Amino acid sequence: QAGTTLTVDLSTTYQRIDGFGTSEAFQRAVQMSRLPEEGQRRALDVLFSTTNGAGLSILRNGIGSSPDMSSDHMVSIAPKSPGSPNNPLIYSWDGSDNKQLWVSQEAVHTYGVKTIYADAWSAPGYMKTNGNDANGGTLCGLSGAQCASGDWRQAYADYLTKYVEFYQESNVTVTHLGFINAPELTTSYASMRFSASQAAEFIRILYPTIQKSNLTYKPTIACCDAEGWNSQAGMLGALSSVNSMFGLVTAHAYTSQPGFSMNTPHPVWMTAAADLQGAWTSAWYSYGGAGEGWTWANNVYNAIVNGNASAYLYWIGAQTGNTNSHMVHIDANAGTVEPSKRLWALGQWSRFVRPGARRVAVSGASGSLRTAAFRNEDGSVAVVVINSGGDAAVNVRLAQPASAKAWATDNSRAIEEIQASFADGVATVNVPSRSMTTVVLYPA
Ligand SMILES: CO[C@H]1[C@H](O)[C@@H](O)[C@@H](O[C@H]2[C@H](O[C@@H]3CO[C@@H](O[C@@H]4CO[C@@H](O)[C@H](O)[C@H]4O)[C@H](O)[C@H]3O)OC[C@@H](O)[C@@H]2O)O[C@@H]1C(=O)O
Ligand SMILES: *[C@@H]1O[C@H](CO)[C@@H](O[C@@H]2O[C@H](CO)[C@@H](O[C@@H]3O[C@H](CO)[C@@H](O)[C@H](O)[C@@H]3O)[C@H](O)[C@H]2NC(C)=O)[C@H](O)[C@H]1NC(C)=O
């Protein structure tokens, strides 16, 4: 044939895409802050730049639960107990939030990011059955968790609301708010155990607290950052009584993969995935291993197409260390920043599939090509082609554009523009070998 023709059907729609992003929690933002100004700027550019970076459109921040910044802990805005939940909470704002406020202010005001997801791993220790933000335990006052010290549920809702207000008064709007992380998992770090029933119980307290607050923008409540699709899907029954009081479902890709559509009315975000203990690799493709850029391009495809995800977040953007827990390597001694091809994989999506995009049908792929298509709010149509074979001539059309452009990521290209020859509404591209290519059709 005269290449492979991919035809986009704008009349067949699926989920909305809210975007793509990562976190700088657990003092990864502090590691970035220690770089020379040029290293700082390069780290921020590769994460958020829509011209020379991954164009990430969501930042996930931790709402620190710890009493201090020991180790990699995130200090809380209220690290000292008031003794009783009947006493006002004592807020001790540091103007920094574990250097996440600076990353957020750069994302929003330098790079145009509009989606800021703040998620607590735990309440402060004095609000919990175990008196500690680490080693699990549950919020005092929930069903099954009566504490000698009192019922701290309203206090935790006031606390989360105050955290959003500190960000607001620092000119950052938190758009989404989570109050647990991995509620099925006890860990040696910030962790807190809620059943799905307890999550619903708390949402019924947190929703009116937010709606009655003086916040300028009322953030959408999220739940529950379970460590896999399967674990989160098991919480949806109990959450269904409060579907009027939260608006985002969140889950990771650790204990199961995002390979089916959850039964919820809400958008579903895959909010953390990584090759956490794999030895550092920057490569796009070596053999299809767990850390390679190629693998992560495909992991995103699977989450969107098979998991019905509206967003995809790698665990950490930039940090130090020699595992694939993160996309961007910091060498603290050299003061340098090196993006892996996992950074470019997520950017090969995020640069072109912007917030509000609607996934749409595309036909004509077979064999070595996996394809998806997205209609942006500006009417630009982004067609993803993941090519596991040799160079593939592809034609991209609607079932009408005035111009086209194309970019590819592979072993020698980092979201590099390639030719998109444009004739009578049809873009013709050479999709490189073992690449992810995005072809964009633009209205006038
Ligand atoms: C080599 O050190 C790595 C660790 O391997 C890695 O876990 C991470 O540690 C962070 C930590 O992150 C976890 C990671 O994602 C979730 O937990 C996973 C769920 O699935 C299980 O099967 C895995 O074993 C879990 O790790 C969880 O929701 C995150 O919080 O966060 C706390 C930090 O204190 C800790 O450093 O990264 C390190 C590293 O990069 O050095
Ligand atoms: C893939 O995910 C999307 C969400 O990102 C799912 O969309 C949701 O679909 C349900 C069922 O159609 C929608 O429920 C309807 O909502 C309206 C209000 O807008 C309500 O009045 C109707 O009675 C109905 O309950 C839900 O709105 C919609 N959510 C969004 C955010 O669009 C979709 O169902 C998922 N796909 C699969 C195959 O599961």
Curated annotation (Swiss-Prot):
Pfam families in alphabetical order: Glyco_hydr_30_2, Glyco_hydro_30C
SUPFAM superfamilies linked to this entry: (Trans)glycosidases, Glycosyl hydrolase domain
Enzyme class: hydrolase
GO molecular function, one term: glucosylceramidase activity
Source species, domain of life: Eukaryota
GO BP, one annotated term: glucosylceramide catabolic process
Applied use: The recombinant xylanase could be used for the production of disaccharide units and uronic xylooligosaccharides from glucuronoxylan, which in turn would be utilized as prebiotics carrying manifold health benefits.
InterPro entries attached to this UniProt entry: 6GAL-like (IPR039514), GH30_C (IPR033452), Glyco_hydro_30 (IPR001139), Glyco_hydro_b (IPR013780), Glycoside_hydrolase_SF (IPR017853)
Regulation (activators, inhibitors): Activity is enhanced by 10 mM Co(2+), Cu 2(2+) and Mn(2+) to levels as high as 44%. Partial inhibition of activity from 5 to 15% is observed in the presence of the following compouinds at a centration of 10 mM (from higher inhibition to lower): EDTA > Mg(2+) > urea, Zn(2+) > Fe(3+).
Transmembrane recorded as keyword: no
Positions annotated with a glycan in the UniProt record: 171, 214, 308
pH dependence text: Optimum pH is 4.0.
Temperature dependence: Optimum temperature is 50 degrees Celsius.
Compartments where located: Secreted
UniProtKB keywords: Glycoprotein, Hydrolase, Secreted, Signal
UniProt EC number: 3.2.1.-
GO cellular component, one term: membrane
UniProt function note: Xylanase exhibiting endo- and exo-xylanase activity. Shows the highest activity toward beechwood glucuronoxylan, which consists of a beta-1,4-linked xylose backbone decorated with the methylated form of D-glucuronic acid (MeGlcA) attached directly to the main chain at xylose C2. Also acts against wheat arabinoxylan, a xylan without MeGlcA substituents along the main chain, but the xylanase activity is about two orders of magnitude lower than that achieved in the case of beechwood xylan. Shows no activity against carob galactomannan, konjac glucomannan, or barley beta-glucan.
Family from the record: Belongs to the glycosyl hydrolase 30 family.
Protein known as: GH30 family xylanase
Protein species of origin: Thermothelomyces thermophilus (strain ATCC 42464 / BCRC 31852 / DSM 1799) (Sporotrichum thermophile)
